[PDB]
Amino acid sequence: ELKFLVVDDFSTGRRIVRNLLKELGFNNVEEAEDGVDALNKLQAGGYGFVISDWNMPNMDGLELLKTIRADGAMSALPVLMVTAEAKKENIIAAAQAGASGYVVKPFTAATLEEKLNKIFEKLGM
């Protein structure tokens, strides 16, 4: 199925998210640790979705978004932003950078589910 990219400098969170996808039925889930680790991986292609945390060393989440969009060969990539807290000014900054969406961690498997479907609802799937 789709090759998701889960980006997070926290082993645990990449574990949780990786598992919410599998328990949701998405097996092809590779992972990255920061904006840089992601970009280098995405640059090979074949990746169809990107979920990434916000705070990250080398290149944070909002930058990784600004960079993916600004690359023709990755402009069209959905990008779920994994925030922490509530309705932080971030949300609008993710919107500003054209985030395909955002989830406030911790999020249940069903919340990921509700989120991705709306993303797939907007694009198509």
- Please provide the distance, in angstroms rounded to a whole number, between the alpha carbons at the two ends of the chain: 12
Contact string (CB under 8 A) for a copy of itself, positions 70-89, x = contact:
--xxxxxxxx----------
Quick check: 125 binds a copy of itself (CB under 8 A)?
yes
SS3 letters across 10-47: CHHHHHHHHHHHHCCCCCCEEEECCHHHHHHHHCCCCC
| Tokens (6 digits) for 95 | 């919107």
Number of residues that bind a copy of itself (CB under 8 A): 30
34 annotated as ligand-binding: no
Would you say 40 is a known binding-site residue? no
Shorter beta-carbon distance to a copy of itself: residue 9 or 69: 69
Q: Show the site string, 27-66: x = touches a copy of itself by CB under 8 A, - = not.
A: -x----------------xxxxx-----------------
Q: What is the DSSP string of 32-97?
A: ESSHHHHHHHHTT----EEEEESS-SSS-HHHHHHHHHTSHHHHT--EEEEEESSS-HHHHHHHHT
Residue 114 engages a copy of itself in binding (rule: CB under 8 A): no
Numbered residues of the known binding site for Mg(2+): 8-9, 53, 55
Q: Which residues bind a copy of itself (CB under 8 A)?
A: 1-3, 28, 45-49, 69, 72-79, 91, 94-95, 98-102, 122-125
